[PDB]
Design a protein around this ligand. Structure first.
Ligand SMILES: *[C@@H]1O[C@H](CO[C@@H]2O[C@@H](C)[C@@H](O)[C@@H](O)[C@@H]2O)[C@@H](O[C@@H]2O[C@H](CO)[C@@H](O[C@@H]3O[C@H](CO)[C@@H](O)[C@H](O)[C@@H]3O)[C@H](O)[C@H]2NC(C)=O)[C@H](O[C@@H]2O[C@@H](C)[C@@H](O)[C@@H](O)[C@@H]2O)[C@H]1NC(C)=O
Ligand SMILES: *[C@@H]1O[C@H](CO)[C@@H](O[C@@H]2O[C@H](CO)[C@@H](O[C@@H]3O[C@H](CO)[C@@H](O)[C@H](O)[C@@H]3O)[C@H](O)[C@H]2NC(C)=O)[C@H](O[C@@H]2O[C@@H](C)[C@@H](O)[C@@H](O)[C@@H]2O)[C@H]1NC(C)=O
Ligand SMILES: *[C@@H]1O[C@H](CO)[C@@H](O)[C@H](O[C@@H]2O[C@@H](C)[C@@H](O)[C@@H](O)[C@@H]2O)[C@H]1NC(C)=O
Length: 952
């Protein structure tokens, strides 16, 4: 990479085109384009969807010009929509409201010192003109002339850089031969006639400008052409001339008519050789050659890729005519150059390659063979799945703009570089499956908010320094080791397990004297899917012996399950101790130990006995004593054989879902106060349960007590310091809510929660703050009240700052945050779970740094899949999350002592019923015997334990 400065009056720009970004497809009298009609057929668009709104730039001029001021670009390339100016294509349809929109944009651009670089035709052909033949017709030269003449006299007093036609190759070939772009015509005999008329339309536009508008307006008029760079597959003369021939058919098809005055002679000969003399390229009239030759002030170039070309006379057969059968060559991807996908294993055959040298050679070729024209790179950029930490785009922007510097030093007269693109949009036939903006656009929000990707920060800094600096040479958007797969084994101490839950597997909700749960009541109130209940579930009350055999087949070291409070105490009181309940858990513990499997017992999970919810449940404050007496009964009966206790599972869910929005049991909706009241007692219940164990049981039993908290990793949406503070704030409010008082050291809530809920409570007119206050004695009982930390981790979220100065009392509104999902993270059967393996690694270091380097167990990890036995999604998930877990141990030193896979078998997924299959075993819930069937994932997990990591 060169650290030289760009020339003095070099233009750093950025590009959009009307249809991918404007939206408002029929607002204010705009007529339909061929792309409106084309995209109305889902089969034409990858991933479906339409551009009826897309990025909605028609309604964001003020916001988008502010983004242009933030980058510091000198100029802005955009497109005028023909059907928005002339709804039916003719000058009689002139729509003043469409004229007003572009005037607003041009005026606002110049008020902020940004040069307009205006394109007249970026494929937006009005549907009415297509209905009468489109570009195949000789009338299209006149249609375009009247339309160009209008924009010249209407905007030309301010617009000084014009592009007649953008990428005629795609308009002709992709739009009329293969049909992949609008208007979807598939006719090999139309393409050369369309390119012919595009060149004639551009010439008529250039002629109109030179004679009627140039003397007064003093602007420039050019055309923009697209070209890949073609490197020969071998050094043989055959392939070197096949590569040069592909450059001729793709770029010289239009460049040679405008420079030399005719189609390239090589191109003329090849088509007549493959099609017949009656079917050659169109002939230019003597007057046509006069109008076309030298009809440019600059040449625009859009470049993206380099491909390998080799001679292939039999690339087609049986006289199958066509644009690429006339050339007699094949194109391949150069897999020798870095792949630009989200992760190393994504799409091995990818064409997105880091080949900046191709742009250097393209520019030098255009300078050498076409008499050194003025060049603007009007479009150059990388297509992504959409991530905002776009190291791939940063590398692309860094390398490719650096090869522009090399062309200028090699004599290339390149005066501008325009990045494709400014925002995300509807990338033609790729639809929304392809993102390219320096700014991400959230297409799930009506206002379509814009957010800078890391490439926006890079481009801003490079323009500020007029080239690269040492900081920009080595700049990275994320650490270089993030996606590297680590082949290694786990430490000797490391345990593998799987987990279940009492209400989700056991059944027998009222057999043998068991009292009812708040989840028995939730289910019997038809609050679960299809009125499905956990009345039988997997019948683990009767079939626990099957569970042990499955655990033996997996080879797990430990098995984490939960005790049902209502099964050992009918009403949650020792007065209702159910010896039958004691015996059931004694049988499960003994069968696990006889099989050499370590039992791990969760005390609570989520099934409070209804008798205690009647007295106020977790809001009642004596629940601290009630939970302590329940913990005592468990420590006495089972403490002799159970050596790892977990007090609570996902106290966040019990607090916010159960007592906040009331979607889980007990179903109380009070999002302002009760979640904090319940979490307060949970912290106080866990602390008293821990001290009861260390004071009265740890000496003789030598066990460890922990707590399990669920948490998504919280990644900043943007590299800004306000978004980094927002991400940490989202961590504190969900994980720190409980972990801070137990693990951080102060025995108290995170300072951010106390500051924020107090201040908002005061504005809302509340006598006391909605977040309770610990007594100094209570804080001291919280301090160090643990032996290990346990984390449930499934997914992550990008977070951004979002002040809410008028928010109502609400645990989520108190946080001043907003959440999204990275578009690159794959989906699962659950709308809230996205696959992001490195989230568990960043989460583990966060817990390590904030909680005094504790012993950590991952108590839950997994995803839903389909019902068939081949769950490749589950395997992909475990393969890479466990590898990221291994990285947190070996590479990061985090004291991770165990890993728990959710779940052992299909079970009742709370409100989602049995429709969400989470298990390594399939469970037939229509069988009375509830047969369990191992999936592919069970073998993969069993094999991974044997290997103790990842070998080779
Ligand atoms: C292209 O649009 C022009 C503007 O018309 C407006 O947009 C079109 C898409 C349509 O929605 C119209 O309703 C809009 O007004 C067309 O010109 C217009 O043509 C119409 C007739 O088609 C004409 O209406 C007539 O006006 C006379 C009085 O002058 C009245 O007695 C009639 O009853 C009827 O109302 C408009 O006045 C006229 N406007 C302008 C500015 O020209 C254009 O149509 C073509 O050109 C006009 C001059 C006539 O010769 C039409 O026969 C002819 O088709 C549209 N062109 C095409 C190819 O569709
Ligand atoms: C938390 O939940 C406990 C357990 O239910 C509540 O204690 C109970 O309060 C009931 C009243 O709400 C008591 O019932 C009354 O008992 C007396 C006899 O003592 C009868 O004469 C009378 O008619 C009622 O039946 C119940 O005895 C009591 N149970 C226990 C074990 O204490 C508790 O309520 C609160 O605390 C108790 C100690 C009393 O002071 C109650 O008046 C008070 O409301 C619940 N606490 C909260 C904050 O909801
Ligand atoms: C492909 O384009 C050529 C050149 O413009 C047309 O002449 C072809 O049309 C042919 O002639 C018409 C009258 C009709 O018979 C059509 O079926 C013929 O192929 C055109 N071909 C197609 C299929 O549209």
């Amino acid at each position: 990479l060169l650290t030289d400065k760009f020339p003095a009056n070099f233009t750093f720009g950025v590009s959009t085109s009307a249809f991918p970004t404007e939206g408002a497809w029929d607002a204010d009298g705009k007529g339909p384009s061929i792309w409106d009609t084309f995209t109305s057929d889902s089969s034409h668009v990858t991933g479906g969807g339409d551009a009826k709104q897309s990025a909605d730039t028609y309604n964001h001029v003020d916001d988008d010009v502010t983004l242009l001021k933030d980058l510091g670009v000198s100029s802005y390339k955009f497109s005028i929509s023909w059907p928005r100016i002339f709804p039916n294509g003719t000058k009689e349809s002139v729509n003043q409201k469409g004229v007003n929109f572009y005037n607003t944009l041009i005026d606002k651009l110049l008020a902020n010192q940004i040069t307009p670089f205006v394109s007249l035709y970026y494929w937006d052909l009005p549907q009415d003109l297509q209905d009468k033949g489109g570009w195949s017709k000789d009338e299209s030269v006149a249609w375009f002339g009247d339309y160009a003449d209008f924009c010249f006299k209407t905007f030309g007093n301010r617009v000084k850089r014009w592009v007649t036609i953008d990428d005629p190759f795609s308009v002709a070939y992709k739009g009329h031969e293969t049909g992949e772009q609008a208007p979807g015509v598939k006719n090999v005999s139309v393409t050369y006639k369309v390119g012919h008329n595009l060149l004639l339309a551009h010439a008529e536009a250039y002629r109109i400008y030179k004679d009627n508008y140039r003397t007064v307006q003093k602007g420039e008029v050019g055309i923009s052409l697209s070209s890949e760079w073609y490197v020969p597959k071998t050094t043989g003369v055959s392939d070197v001339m096949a590569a040069r021939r592909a450059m001729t058919f793709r770029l010289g098809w239009f460049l040679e008519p405008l420079v030399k005055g005719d189609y390239p002679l090589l191109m003329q000969q090849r088509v007549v050789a493959a099609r017949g003399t009656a079917n050659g390229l169109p002939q230019f009239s003597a007057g046509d050659k006069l109008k076309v030759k030298d009809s440019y002030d600059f040449i625009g170039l859009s470049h993206f890729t380099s491909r390998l070309v080799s001679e292939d006379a039999g690339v087609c057969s049986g006289a199958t005519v066509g644009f690429f059968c006339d050339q007699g060559l094949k194109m391949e991807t150069d897999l020798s150059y870095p792949k630009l996908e989200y992760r190393p294993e994504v799409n091995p055959t990818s064409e997105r390659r880091l080949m900046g040298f191709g742009l250097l050679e393209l520019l030098k070729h255009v300078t050498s063979d076409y008499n050194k024209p003025v060049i603007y790179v009007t479009e150059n950029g990388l297509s992504s799945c959409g991530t905002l930490q776009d190291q791939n785009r940063v590398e692309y922007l860094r390398e490719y703009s650096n090869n522009v510097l090399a062309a200028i030093k090699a004599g290339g007269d390149v005066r501008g570089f325009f990045v494709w693109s400014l925002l995300d949009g509807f990338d033609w036939s790729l639809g929304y499956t392809s993102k390219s903006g320096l700014y991400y656009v959230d297409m799930g929000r009506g206002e379509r908010p814009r957010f800078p990707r890391s490439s926006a920060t890079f481009y801003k800094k490079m323009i500020a320094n007029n080239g690269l600096t040492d900081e920009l040479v080595t700049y990275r958007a994320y650490p270089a080791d993030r996606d590297v797969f680590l082949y290694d084994t786990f430490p000797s101490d490391f345990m593998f397990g799987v987990a279940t839950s009492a209400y989700q597997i056991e059944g027998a909700w009222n057999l043998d004297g068991k009292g009812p749960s708040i989840w028995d009541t939730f289910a019997h109130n038809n609050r679960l899917a299809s009125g499905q209940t956990g009345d039988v579930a997997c019948d683990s009350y009767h079939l626990y012996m099957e569970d042990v055999r499955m655990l033996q087949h997996l080879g797990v070291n430990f098995y984490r399950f939960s005790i049902a409070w209502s099964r050992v105490m009918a009403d949650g009181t020792p007065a209702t101790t159910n010896q039958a309940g004691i015996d059931y858990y004694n049988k499960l513990i003994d069968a696990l130990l006889a099989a050499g499997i370590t039992p791990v017992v969760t005390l609570y999970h989520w099934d409070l006995p209804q008798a205690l919810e009647n007295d106020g449940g977790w809001k009642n404050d004596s629940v601290v004593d009630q939970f302590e007496a329940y913990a005592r009964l468990c420590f006495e009966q089972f403490g002799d054989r159970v050596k790892y206790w977990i007090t609570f599972n996902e106290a966040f869910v019990v607090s916010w879902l159960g007592y906040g929005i009331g979607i889980f049991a007990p179903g109380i909706y009070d999002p302002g106060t009760s979640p904090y009241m319940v979490a307060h007692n949970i912290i106080r219940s866990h602390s008293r349960a821990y001290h009861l164990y260390s004071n009265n049981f740890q000496a003789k039993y030598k066990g460890k007590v922990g707590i399990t908290l669920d948490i998504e990793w919280k990644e900043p949406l943007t590299d800004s310091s306000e978004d980094a503070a927002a991400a940490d704030r989202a961590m504190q409010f969900k994980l720190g809510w409980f972990a801070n008082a137990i693990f951080a050291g102060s025995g108290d809530y995170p300072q951010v929660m106390r500051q924020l809920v107090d201040e908002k409570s005061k504005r809302q007119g509340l006598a006391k703050s909605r977040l309770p206050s610990f007594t100094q004695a209570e804080k001291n009982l919280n301090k160090g009240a643990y032996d290990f930390l346990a984390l449930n981790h499934y997914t992550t979220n990008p977070v951004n700052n979002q002040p809410r100065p008028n928010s109502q009392p609400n645990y989520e509104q108190d946080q001043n945050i907003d959440t999204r999902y990275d578009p690159c993270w794959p989906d699962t059967d659950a709308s809230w779970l996205k696959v992001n393996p490195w989230g568990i690694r960043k989460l583990l270091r966060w817990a390590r740094d904030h909680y005094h380097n504790p012993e950590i167990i991952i108590s839950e990890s997994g995803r839903p899949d389909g019902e068939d036995l081949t769950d490749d999604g589950r395997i992909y998930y475990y393969k890479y999350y466990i590898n990221e877990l291994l990285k947190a141990i070996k590479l990061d030193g985090v004291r991770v002592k165990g890993y728990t896979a959710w779940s052992l078998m299909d079970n009742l997924e709370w409100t989602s019923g049995y429709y969400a299959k989470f298990g390594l075993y399939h469970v037939d819930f229509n069988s009375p015997n509830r047969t369990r069937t191992p999936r592919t994932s069970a073998t993969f997990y069993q094999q991974l334990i044997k290997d103790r990591g990842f070998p080779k």
